[PDB]
C-alpha cells in the first residue's frame, strides 16, 4: 500500500522506520544476519523485559511492572542487578544505542530485535511484530523473573500471575532450543541446552527428557543437573518441567513436530509481547519480518541413545516415534 523511501512495500507508514532498524541490526548487532550469541541474549532480554508484569502486585496496591515496556534498558541500572539479568549489559548497551539512533521505543526495539533475530535461525516461525509501545517506563519490581532453582510450583505461579497457563510456559521454553549458559557454570562457557543451538527445533524437548548421565564440567554450577552427553548443560528448572505432571504432556507433545512447536511458540510470544499494552492500540508491521531459512532436519534421539533412555513422563500418551542415530554419544561444541 505504502511505499517507504527504500522501495519497501508495507502496510503502514509507521513501519517505514523499522526497515532502517532491520538493516542496522542485521549488519551490526547480528554481524551479518547470523544466529549466534546476540540472538540468544536478545531472547533472554525479551522475556526479562516482558515478565516484569504482576497483576498480583497491582491487586495488592503496588506497582506491578509495565511488561514489554523497555524498562530493562531504560532502567538497566536497577534491573541488571536482578539475579536473572547477569551477562546482559553488553547486549543492553548495544540495543540502547540502536534505539536512540533510530528514535524507536526501547520496548518496541526489544520485540523487533527478537523477531529479526529469530528470523536468522533456521526453522523459526515468523514472529509477529507490532509497533507503538510508549518509550516511557518505570523500573520493574524485583523478584518477577523465574529462576532455574525455582520449583515448578513457583515457576507456574509466577508465570501464571503474569498471564501464562502451564502449557504456555512450556511453549515459551522453545527458546531454549537456541540456547547456552554462560553464568551458571563458568568452567563450560556457552555449553548448549540442546544439540542444535543454532536451529529452532524440537531437540531441546527431546534431550531434556533423556536420562541424566553426564557431568559436562569439572564441578556443578548453580541449578545444574546431570545432562545426557558431554558438552550439554541441563538446568534444574528444565529438568523438572520436562518431568512434572503439570507440564510433561505438553513437553512430550513438542518432541515430534517442529511445525506445531513453531506455531505454539509464535502464539505465546505474541501474548508476551504485549504484556502491559493493548495490542489493538498498536500497528502491525509483521511484514517487515522476513521468513527464516527452513530447517530440513528430522527430530532425532542423539548418539545411539534410544527411547529406553527417555524418561517418559506423560502417563497417558505413548512417546512419539523419533529416529535414533549411530553412537557414540556426541560432545557438544560451545554455542557460537
Ligand atoms: C521457566 C522459565 C525459564 C527459566 C528458569 C530460564 C532460565 C535460564 C537460565 C538460568 C539461562 C542461562 C543464562 C546464562 O547463564 O547465561 C537461560 C538461557 C536462555 N534462556 Fe531462559 N529461562 C526460562 C525461560 C525462557 C524464555 C521464556 C525465553 C525466551 C522466550 C528464554 C530464552 C533463553 C535463551 C535464548 C537462553 C540462552 C542464552 C545464551 O545462550 O546466552 N528462557 N534461561
Ligand atoms: C526513551 O527514553 C530513554 C530514557 O529517557 C531515552 O534514553 C536517553 O536518551 C538520551 C538522549 O538520546 C541519552 O543521552 C541517554 O543516555 C538515554 N538514557 C538511557 C537510560 O538510555 C531515549 O532517548 C528515549 N527514546 C525516545 C525514542 O524517545
Ligand atoms: C567434548 O567435545 C566438545 C568440543 O568438541 C566440548 O565442548 C565438550 O565439553 C567435550 O569436551
Ligand atoms: Ca519491562
Ligand atoms: Ca535447537
From Swiss-Prot:
Residues the entry annotates as binding Ca(2+) 1: 49, 67, 69, 71
Residues annotated to bind Ca(2+) 2: 177, 194, 196, 199, 201
Residues reported in the UniProt entry to bind heme b: 176
Cofactor, how bound (note): Binds 2 calcium ions per subunit. Binds 1 heme b (iron(II)-protoporphyrin IX) group per subunit.
Bridged cysteine pairs (disulfide): 4-16, 15-285, 35-121, 249-314
Pfam family, one: Peroxidase_ext
Gene Ontology biological process terms from the UniProt entry: cellular response to oxidative stress; hydrogen peroxide catabolic process; response to reactive oxygen species
Cofactor requirements of the protein: Ca(2+); heme b
Catalyzed chemical reaction(s): 2 a phenolic donor + H2O2 = 2 a phenolic radical donor + 2 H2O
Intracellular or extracellular location(s): Secreted
Keyword Cytoplasm among record annotations: no
Main localization, broad class: secreted
Glycosylation sites: 135
Gene Ontology terms, MF aspect: heme binding; lactoperoxidase activity; metal ion binding
EC number: 1.11.1.7
Keywords per UniProt: Calcium, Disulfide bond, Glycoprotein, Heme, Hydrogen peroxide, Iron, Metal-binding, Oxidoreductase, Peroxidase, Pyrrolidone carboxylic acid, Secreted, Signal
GO cellular component, one term: extracellular region
Keyword Phosphoprotein: no
Coiled coil regions in record: none
Marked site: Transition state stabilizer: 44
Active site, UniProt feature: 48
InterPro entries: Ccp1-like (IPR044831), Haem_peroxidase (IPR002016), Haem_peroxidase_sf (IPR010255), Ligninase (IPR001621), Ligninase_C (IPR024589), Peroxidases_AS (IPR019794), Peroxidases_heam-ligand_BS (IPR019793)
Family designation: Belongs to the peroxidase family. Ligninase subfamily.
Name the UniProt record assigns to this protein: Peroxidase
Organism of provenance: Arthromyces ramosus
Amino acid at each position: 500500500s505504502v511505499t517507504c523511501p527504500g522501495g519497501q512495500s508495507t502496510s503502514n507508514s509507521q513501519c517505514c522506520v523499522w526497515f532502517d532498524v532491520l538493516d542496522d541490526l542485521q549488519t551490526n548487532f547480528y554481524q551479518g544476519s547470523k544466529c549466534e550469541s546476540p540472538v540468544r541474549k536478545i531472547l533472554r532480554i525479551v522475556f526479562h523485559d516482558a515478565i516484569g508484569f504482576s497483576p498480583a502486585l497491582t491487586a495488592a496496591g503496588q506497582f506491578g511492572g509495565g511488561g514489554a515496556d523497555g524498562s530493562i534498558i531504560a532502567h538497566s541500572n536497577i534491573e541488571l542487578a536482578f539475579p536473572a539479568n547477569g551477562g546482559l549489559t553488553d547486549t543492553i548497551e548495544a540495543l540502547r544505542a540502536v534505539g536512540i539512533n533510530h528514535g524507536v521505543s526501547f520496548g518496541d526495539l526489544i520485540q523487533f530485535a527478537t523477531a529479526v533475530g529469530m528470523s536468522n535461525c533456521p526453522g523459526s516461525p515468523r514472529l509477529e511484530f507490532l509497533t507503538g509501545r510508549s518509550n516511557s517506563s518505570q523500573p520493574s519490581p524485583p523478584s518477577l523473573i523465574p529462576g532455574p532453582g525455582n520449583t515448578v510450583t513457583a515457576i507456574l505461579d509466577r508465570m501464571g500471575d503474569a498471564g501464562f497457563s502451564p502449557d504456555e510456559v512450556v511453549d515459551l521454553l522453545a527458546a531454549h532450543s537456541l540456547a547456552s549458559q554462560e553464568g551458571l557454570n563458568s568452567a563450560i562457557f556457552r555449553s548448549p541446552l540442546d544439540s542444535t543451538p543454532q536451529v529452532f527445533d524440537t531437540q531441546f524437548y527431546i534431550e531434556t527428557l533423556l536420562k541424566g548421565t553426564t557431568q559436562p564440567g569439572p564441578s556443578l554450577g548453580f541449578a545444574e543437573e546431570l545432562s545426557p552427553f558431554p558438552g550439554e548443560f541441563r538446568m534444574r528448572s528444565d529438568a523438572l518441567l520436562a518431568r512434572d505432571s503439570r507440564t510433561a504432556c505438553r513437553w512430550q507433545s513438542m518432541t515430534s513436530s517442529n511445525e506445531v512447536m513453531g506455531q505454539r511458540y509464535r502464539a505465546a510470544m505474541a501474548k508476551m509481547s504485549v504484556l502491559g499494552f493493548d495490542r489493538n492500540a498498536l500497528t502491525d508491521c509483521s511484514d517487515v519480518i522476513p521468513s527464516a531459512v527452513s530447517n530440513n532436519a528430522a527430530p532425532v534421539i542423539p548418539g545411539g541413545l534410544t527411547v529406553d533412555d527417555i524418561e517418559v513422563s506423560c502417563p497417558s500418551e505413548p512417546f512419539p516415534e523419533i529416529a535414533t542415530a549411530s553412537g557414540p554419544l556426541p560432545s557438544l561444541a560451545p554455542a557460537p
